[PDB]
């Protein structure tokens, strides 16, 4: 009836101590990564977000300047520029998934 | 949390696993209605495409 | 019942479904070959009025149905699903629920393929769907779009099946089966799954690139836009040459197991056999552009690909000789599986010599895109992979089904298919050396000689297939009576010289695998208490 | 009395698309940019009129005129 | 060993040359019988 | 343990799943998507209302497949140690296939970059294309993605340690720091000068980053289901396989971004 | 070596406790490339008498006849084994005419 043999009692106390050893190693190494996050990751994002914020506004004024004057018409397209082998099925004939009418025009020079 | 009382319900149910939870009737019934429309409607356009009529 | 077959989780039922789909697609794809032979029997358009379309469409359908719907589901999904768990000793596969979706996405591909054929255009592009001809300007219908979708479904089926076999082999073995001590069929399946895993994604990327270029306006291969139609060749054949080895490596395990049971002596040098089997798979990834010799590559890369492809013959030859060394001393039992294996040993070596003849880039400028190559790959496919499929069926069916199959009526089928296929595929090398191109429906008159002979031989093989269907019917119906009368052979191993008839009847099966020790048919739950080895 | 373009270093192989293209670019930069001498420019002119398909020339002639030539002639 | 091997070896080479001439030389029959 | 008791349990460590209808329901949903998409591309329907329906059914059926997996692992408890190794091994073999899909996309980039085509300019990128500037905005995404790997690491070890306020906070920052990547990538796509239709350059550019973009949206969903399961006491301190495969997924997906940042952004301008 | 071979099957046959073991050892002795020495065969005959099986003793020479490969060497084995065979009573196949 006993099925299994006598308990090892040596695998135990070597399995039940590795669990304590594992959680102890995760306890302090977690504190190490928190120190890295606050003292390395957080300053890095703050010093690159303030830079990107300023450069982004410089681009924004350029983009709204395009609409103001067509002037000399939009730059002409090379032979590989706009490919219309088969018109798009979603809506009008020639507009891609993300279209910004400000910067994408596709004027036809016939 | 509720895992202990959810464990006692899923075990000892003698029902399909997707019908055991008491809230399962809300998902399954609307699903089979939409599912039928999804797998039968494209099959109606097959003979229309074979003839060549474009809608 | 719906639950048993529509909600399948048992691996043996999925194997039976894979088998059942394979025969239907096999009969469907071998009638298009009959129509092709009838159209090529004589010069001039004889049966198809003048339609060059519906000839290329039939060729595409034939190739796809024979490769992706007969050999793949039978060798890998049929035999691999049914036999790998049993020889390893696992009760079922590691992921039993994705094993069902690995099958049920195959019938959807058949619907996509048929509805692609029925649209007014059709897909006359070949099984290698090259971009510029299958672009939107030359094939303007929704046909090749539906053909591409079928390839995605087959690819996802094969990928999900391949992931299942790697995990199943690695950590579902029994109590004594170390990775060093495996049957050779499991080794072949393992290596095949690893080739599939690393080769399928590149095909998926190229095929999706083709789809997006036809419908989403991406200059992926469009010449006007900087695209290169030769990049597609690299992307496709990187899955293409390794592929010709997914269809033969599981064919090697079957032959390895067959020739050591009806020849009562174990395989000569097994570890060298697994080394050579792994080397063919590993080194086949370094030779893909021999299919692209005349595309205009550099002179120095042609030398590399010529030198690397001939190394394939070193391990391959090792497998040919080690098969001839395990039958040298033993006692030979000439049954139907042994007749198929012996025919395979000869026909595959005839195919491989022509293959090494094709491997030289300087000579391939005279043998490329001719019927020479067709005759080549019809020896290793129609006589190398089909024969091991017949040998595997005749080897395992009485154990799997529990029904015998009237030996003398099967040897007739063997001889008919032998002398029928040899008639179709031997004259092709004569047509190829005179410069007869591929993929044409009608040819100059001077080629009418061997084409008639090859067309006569197709009817013999078709008659053999019909006889095989009748053998299936006579096995399922009154097959329990075949082992009562004297129509079939019951024991695959005769007693030894000094072994009496009353001692053979207490040790009936002296096998080196668990497959032949199970009940016939095997139980639904085969292994309750795990089996122990060594 | 037969002759043709000789073997060229840098273009020693089967693929010859760039060899055609460079001669067309070189020819126009030979004339518009410091075209002080007629004779040396003819080496390219007999080199792209050879080895190059005809219809490519008319396509590149329209793209140059319209201002959409990829090559930098100036 | 010369006496024993001779009784079995040499007849087989003659049978050998026959079968291989059939599997490989069969298309010669069709061409001659009536290339016409 | 009595011999009678042991026989009232499985004799093997592998998990036997009951018959299920989802493997075929997803199969039928994949045919409707394949068959409806092939029609709307050429007409034959008229509007794109059936494509949306097919995608919805495809997604909803997949949710009900994952809904069953969490039930048999958390309430029925069929994931023994042997089963857990196969799931981890199966995911590792699945990310290798994902990498090789990207390997086919880098090959397409190097083919047209090392020897640029003649229909393009003699140079690369082609003449008249304003490529994305590597230092202004993509560099913000690079710092963001690296910081995601640092905050999911101590969220993982805090869960092992035993405190739930740091583990729960690490995921919340991880989710919102991935959403910022998706929204910032959305801003650049709608402000770019070139489109997918701009020759070969736009095809390879938007296929590499676009495939990564579609993978980041599936990463946020995976992170979202770990926050629900952690908050409602599903993930335990020593058994979390749905979370280990998420940490491997985000670390592997940072290496792929670094490779896409060196060749598509720096080396390609 | 041959002498080591002969002296180790001379010991294997002396320990064969049933009719399954005798037919297992003799299938091993004749499975080797070498034709066994006449000293080996004599012990095999004794084993068959010990387990009381006449037909396996008859098959000993039938195995030898195909194994010895020489028409005079079969006579050479025949002459030295005349005394033991006649004493035991084993008939040859040709004499028996079965
Ligand atoms: C199961 C299928 C299968 C197998 C196993 C092979 C095996 C080989 N194949 Fe190929 N092959 C195809 C299927 C296969 N092939 C298909 C379908 C095509 C055409 C695809 C298409 O274009 O549509 C093709 C095309 C193909 C080409 C391209 C031809 C062209 O398109 O111009 C080449 C080039 O070298 C090639 C070579 C080889 C070689 C060297 C082997 C080697 O593996 C063979 C090695 C065999 C031997 C070496 C003989 C056995 C060994 C001995 C007897 C030992 C003694 C040997 C020596 C001393 C050398 N075959
Ligand atoms: C497994 C692959 C396979 C098989 C079995 C076959 C079998 C046959 N094929 Fe071939 N064929 C190809 C793969 C195959 N083929 C490929 C890839 C091409 C290239 C297409 C292209 O150019 O695009 C091709 C092209 C091809 C051509 C050249 C077309 C062209 O270039 O224009 C011809 C010409 O006669 C031909 C004829 C035949 C004939 C008469 C048979 C058969 O009659 C031969 C005898 C075999 C059988 C009758 C099958 C028996 C077995 C079963 C039916 C399965 C059931 C059995 C078990 C489960 C054990 N097929
Ligand atoms: C090996 C098994 C058999 C292999 C297949 C043999 C096929 C023989 C064959 O096709 O022969 C037909 C020719 C017809 O004669 P023909 O010279 O070709 O003239 C043309 C006549 N048509 C074709 C229009 C009818 O007539 C012949 O030339 C008949 C020759 C028959 C030779 C014996 C069989 C082959 C050798 C065994
Ligand atoms: C599953 C695999 C993914 C799905 C593949 C099929 C569906 C693809 C749909 C693509 C639709 C499309 O046109 O996408 C366009 C976008 C961006 O294109 P855009 O709108 O021109 O972007 C620039 C916007 N301007 C500058 C104008 C303001 O481009 C993208 O965002 C493209 C993202 C998708 C890229 C797919 C790559 C597939 C590679 C092989 C995958 C094999 C599996
Ligand atoms: C591509 C699909 C995803 C493949 C990668 C995941 C496969 C490895 C993980 C795994 O075994 O779980 C699977 C669940 O994911 C799935 O396969 C469910 C997602 C299916 C997506 C369909 C489009 C199959 O698990 P299982 O349910 O087969 O076995 C459960 C035994 N305890
Ligand atoms: C298409 C590609 C699809 C890829 C699917 C990848 C699946 C990976 C996970 C595979 C199963 C892992 C597993 O068993 O984890 C369970 C939860 O996972 C789950 O149930 C995860 C489901 C969420 C995945 C969402 C991915 C996006 C799908 C988009 C549509 C397709 C519970 O295991 P546990 O050990 O944590 O339980 C502890 C209980 N005490
Ligand atoms: C080949 C050439 C073409 C032959 C055409 C035959 C037509 C049908 C006749 C059937 C006769 C019959 O039934 O043959 C029966 C014979 C004799 O059997 P048995 O001694 O038991 O006696 C039966 C009465 N008791 O067994 C065999 O066939 C077995 C031998 C087959 C050998 C291999 C066959 C496969 C080809 C391998 C490749 C070639 C190897 C050699 C290469 C040079
Ligand atoms: Ca005809
Ligand atoms: Cu190849």
Question: How would you portray this structure in words?
Answer:
Chain E: Keywords: Membrane, Mitochondrion, Mitochondrion inner membrane, Transit peptide, Transmembrane, Transmembrane helix. Chain E: It is found in: Mitochondrion inner membrane. Chain E: Belongs to the fungal cytochrome c oxidase subunit 26 family. Chain E: The chain crosses the membrane at residues 1-36. Chain E: It is a single-pass membrane protein. Helix content of chain A is 48%, strand content 0%. Chain A is mainly alpha-helical. Chain D is built from three helices and no strands. The radius of gyration of chain D is 13 Å and the shape is globular. With 269 residues, chain F is mostly helical. The longest helix of chain F has 34 residues, at 81-114. Chain G has seven helices and no strands. Chain G has a single domain (1-98), classed as Serine Threonine Protein Phosphatase 5, Tetratricopeptide repeat (Alpha Horseshoe), CATH 1.25.40. Chain G is globular, with a radius of gyration of 13 Å. At the C-F interface, helix 1, helix 4, helix 5, helix 6 and helix 7 of C face helix 2, helix 4 and helix 7 of F. The site of copper (II) ion (CU) has 3 residues of chain C, from helix 7.
CATH fold descriptor of the largest domain in chain F: Four Helix Bundle (Hemerythrin (Met), subunit A)
Total of helices of chain F: 8
Provide the succession of SSEs of chain F.
HHHHHHHH
How would you describe the shape of chain F?
globular
Separation of termini of chain F?
Answer: 71 Å
**Helicity level of chain G:** over 70%
The Cα radius of gyration of chain F reads: 23 Å
User: CATH superfamily name of the largest domain in chain F?
Assistant: Cytochrome c oxidase, subunit III, four-helix bundle
Helix fraction bin of chain F? over 70%
- Terminal residue distance of chain G: 38 Å
CATH class of the largest domain in chain F: Mainly Alpha
Question: What's the tally of helices of chain G?
Answer: 7
The CATH class of chain G, by name, is Mainly Alpha
What do we call the CATH homologous superfamily of chain G? Answer: Cytochrome c oxidase, subunit Va/VI
Question: What's this model, at a glance?
Answer:
Helices cover about 50% and strands about 0% of the residues of chain A. Chain A has about 110 residues and is an all-alpha fold.
Layout of secondary structure:
The structure is cut from a larger assembly and holds seven protein chains of seven kinds.
Chain D: H1 17-31, H2 42-48, H3 54-66
Chain E: H1 2-34
Chain F: H1 3-6, H2 22-40, H3 49-74, H4 81-114, H5 138-161, H6 164-189, H7 199-231, H8 241-266
The site of copper (II) ion has 3 residues of chain C, from helix 7.
Catalytic activity (chain F): 4 Fe(II)-[cytochrome c] + O2 + 8 H(+)(in) = 4 Fe(III)-[cytochrome c] + 2 H2O + 4 H(+)(out)
EC number (chain F): 7.1.1.9
Mitochondrial intermembrane side (chain F): 42-48, 115-137, 189-201, 266-269
Notable features of this structure?
part of a larger assembly; 7 chains; A: 110 residues; mainly alpha; 1 helix; elongated; E: 36 residues; 0% strand; rod-shaped; binds heme-A; binds 1,2-diacyl-SN-glycero-3-phoshocholine; binds phosphatidylethanolamine; binds di-palmitoyl-3-SN-phosphatidylethanolamine; electron transport; Oxidoreductase; Respiration
């Amino acid at each position: 009836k006993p099925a299994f043999g006598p308990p090892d009692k040596v695998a135990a106390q070597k399995f039940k101590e590795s669990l304590m050893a594992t959680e102890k190693h995760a306890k302090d190494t977690s504190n190490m990564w928190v120190k890295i996050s606050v003292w390395v990751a957080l300053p890095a994002i703050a010093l690159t977000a303030v830079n990107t914020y300023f450069v982004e506004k410089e681009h924004a004024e350029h983009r709204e300047h395009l609409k103001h004057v067509p002037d000399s018409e939009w730059p002409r397209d090379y032979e590989f520029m706009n490919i219309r082998s088969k018109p798009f099925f979603w809506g009008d004939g020639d507009k891609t998934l993300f279209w910004n009418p400000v910067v994408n025009r596709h004027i036809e020079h016939d | 949390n509720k895992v202990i009382q959810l464990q006692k319900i899923f075990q000892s149910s003698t029902k399909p696993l997707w019908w055991r939870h008491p809230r399962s009737a809300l998902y399954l019934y609307p699903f089979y209605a939409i599912f039928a429309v999804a797998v039968v409607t494209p099959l109606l356009y097959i003979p229309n495409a074979i003839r060549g009529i474009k809608a | 019942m719906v639950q048993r077959w529509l909600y399948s989780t048992n691996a043996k039922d999925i194997a039976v479904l894979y088998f059942m789909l394979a025969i239907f697609s096999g009969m469907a794809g071998t009638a298009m070959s009959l129509i092709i032979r009838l159209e090529l029997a004589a010069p001039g358009s004889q049966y198809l009025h003048g339609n060059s379309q519906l000839f290329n469409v039939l060729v595409v359908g034939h190739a796809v149905l024979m490769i992706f719907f007969l050999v793949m589901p039978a060798l890998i999904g049929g035999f691999g699903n049914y036999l790998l768990p049993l020889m390893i000793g696992a009760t079922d596969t590691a992921f039993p629920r994705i094993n069902n979706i690995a099958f049920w996405v195959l019938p959807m591909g058949l619907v996509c393929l048929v509805t692609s054929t029925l649209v007014e255009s059709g897909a006359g592009t070949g099984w290698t769907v090259y971009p510029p001809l299958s672009s939107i300007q030359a094939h303007s219908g929704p046909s090749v779009d539906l053909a591409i979708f079928a390839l995605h479904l087959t690819s996802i089926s094969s990928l999900l099946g391949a992931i299942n076999f790697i995990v199943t082999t690695l950590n579902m073995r029994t109590n004594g089966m170390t990775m060093h001590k495996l049957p050779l069929f499991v080794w072949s399946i393992f290596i095949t799954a690893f080739l599939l895993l690393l080769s399928l994604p590149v095909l998926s990327a190229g095929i999706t690139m083709l789809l997006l270029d036809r419908n989403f306006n991406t200059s992926f291969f469009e010449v006007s836009g900087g695209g290169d139609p030769i990049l597609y060749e690299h992307l496709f054949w990187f899955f293409g040459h390794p592929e010709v080895y997914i269809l033969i490596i599981p064919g090697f395990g079957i032959i390895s197991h067959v020739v050591s049971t009806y020849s009562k002596k174990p395989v000569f040098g097994e570890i060298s056999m697994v080394y050579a089997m792994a080397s063919i798979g590993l080194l086949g990834f370094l030779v893909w552009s021999h299919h692209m010799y005349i595309v205009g590559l550099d002179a120095d890369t042609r030398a590399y690909f010529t030198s690397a492809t001939m190394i394939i013959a070193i391990p391959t030859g090792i497998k040919i000789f080690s098969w001839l060394a395990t039958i040298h001393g033993g006692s030979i039992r000439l049954a139907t599986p042994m007749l198929y294996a012996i025919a395979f040993l000869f026909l595959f070596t005839m195919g491989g010599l022509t293959g090494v003849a094709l491997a030289n880039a300087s000579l391939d400028v005279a043998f490329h895109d001719t019927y020479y190559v067709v005759g080549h790959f019809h020896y290793v496919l129609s006589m190398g992979a089909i024969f091991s499929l017949f040998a595997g069926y005749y080897y395992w069916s009485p154990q799997i089904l529990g029904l015998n199959y009237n030996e003398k009526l099967a040897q007739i089928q063997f001889w008919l298919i032998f002398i029928g296929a040899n008639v179709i595929f031997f004259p092709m090398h004569f047509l190829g050396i005179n410069g007869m191109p591929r993929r044409i429906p009608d040819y100059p008159d001077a080629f009418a000689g061997w084409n008639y002979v090859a067309s006569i031989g197709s009817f013999i093989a078709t008659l053999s297939l019909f006889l095989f269907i009748y053998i299936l019917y006579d096995q399922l119906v009154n097959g329990l009576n075949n082992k009562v009368n004297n129509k079939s052979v019951i024991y695959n191993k005769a007693p030894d010289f000094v072994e009496s008839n009353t001692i053979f009847n207490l040790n009936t099966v002296k096998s080196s695998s668990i497959e032949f020790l199970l009940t016939s048919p095997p139980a639904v739950h085969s292994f309750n208490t795990p089996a122990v080895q060594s | 009395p037969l002759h043709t373009v000789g073997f060229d270093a840098r273009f020693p192989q089967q693929n010859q698309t760039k060899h055609c293209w460079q001669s067309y670019v070189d020819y126009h930069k030979c004339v518009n940019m410091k075209g002080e001498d007629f004779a040396p420019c003819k080496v390219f002119w007999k080199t792209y009129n050879a080895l190059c398909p005809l219809d490519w020339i008319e396509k590149w002639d329209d793209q140059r005129e319209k201002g959409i030539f990829a090559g930098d002639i100036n | 060993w010369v006496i024993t091997e001779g009784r079995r070896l040499i007849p087989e080479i003659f049978q050998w040359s026959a079968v291989l001439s059939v599997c490989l030389g069969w298309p010669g029959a069709v061409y001659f019988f009536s290339k016409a | 343990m009595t011999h009678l008791e042991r026989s009232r349990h499985q004799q093997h460590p592998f998990h036997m799943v009951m018959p299920s209808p989802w493997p075929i329901v997803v199969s039928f949903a994949l045919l409707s998507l394949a068959l409806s998409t092939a029609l709307t591309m050429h007409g034959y329907i008229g509007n794109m209302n059936m494509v949306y329906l097919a995608l919805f059914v495809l997604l909803t059926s997949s949710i009900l497949w994952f809904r069953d997996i969490v039930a048999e692992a958390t309430y029925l408890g069929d994931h023994t140690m042997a089963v857990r190794k196969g799931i981890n091994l199966g995911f590792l073999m699945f990310v290798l296939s994902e990498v090789l899909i990207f390997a086919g996309l880098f090959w397409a980039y190097f083919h047209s970059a090392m020897s640029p085509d003649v229909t393009l300019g003699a140079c690369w990128p082609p003449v008249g294309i304003e490529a994305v500037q590597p230092t202004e905005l993509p560099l913000l995404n690079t710092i963001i993605l690296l910081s995601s790997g640092a905050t999911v690491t101590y969220s993982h070890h805090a869960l092992i340690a035993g405190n739930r306020n740091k583990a729960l906070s690490g995921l919340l920052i991880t989710f919102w720091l991935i959403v910022i990547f998706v929204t910032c990538q959305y801003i650049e796509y709608t402000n770019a000068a070139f489109t997918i239709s701009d020759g070969v350059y736009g095809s390879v550019f938007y296929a590499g980053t676009g495939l990564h973009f579609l993978h980041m949206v599936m990463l946020a969903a995976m992170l979202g289901v770990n926050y629900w399961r952690m908050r409602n006491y599903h993930l335990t301190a020593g058994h979390h396989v749905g979370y280990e495969t998420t940490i491997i997924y985000t670390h592997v997906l940072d290496v792929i971004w670094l490779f896409l940042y060196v060749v598509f952004y720096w080396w390609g301008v | 070596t041959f002498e080591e071979f002969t002296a180790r099957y001379e010991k294997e046959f002396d320990e064969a406790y049933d009719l399954f073991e005798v037919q297992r050892v003799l299938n091993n002795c004749f499975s080797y490339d070498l034709v066994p020495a006449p000293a080996v065969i004599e012990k095999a005959l004794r084993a068959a008498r010990r387990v009381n099986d006449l037909p396996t003793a008859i098959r000993v020479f039938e195995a030898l006849k195909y194994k010895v490969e020489n028409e005079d060497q079969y006579k050479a084995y025949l002459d030295e084994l005349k005394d033991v065979r006649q004493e035991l009573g084993v008939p040859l196949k040709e004499e028996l005419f079965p």
